[PDB]
Amino acid sequence: DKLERCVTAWAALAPMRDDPDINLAMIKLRIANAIGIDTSGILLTEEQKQQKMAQQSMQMGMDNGAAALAQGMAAQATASPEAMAAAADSVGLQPGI
């Protein structure tokens, strides 16, 4: 019940997510403190926030890189009919049919 009250109270802070004046972290801690839940670990540590920023950066990096690699690799595979045959012999396919 205490946890569900915090989530509803925290969900009320969603409209002001982009507010530049109010310290939303301070309000979130105060809301949790007033409810009485153990506040250890509910707030992200500064290193944890940095890790999440890196992970989403790596998500875009790997996902863009995987797309960019395949488009570039496909272009070299179909660059010439001779290189076209090379791809078939690589994967085990055959040009003669």
């Binding site: 076209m84 040009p95 003669g96 049919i97």
Partner: peptide, 14 residues
């Protein structure tokens, strides 16, 4: 002397 893509609009089946 080969091209990979399948051609369907006008070509004969053979």
């Amino acid at each position: 002397c080969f091209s990979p893509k399948i051609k369907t609009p006008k070509m004969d089946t053979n």
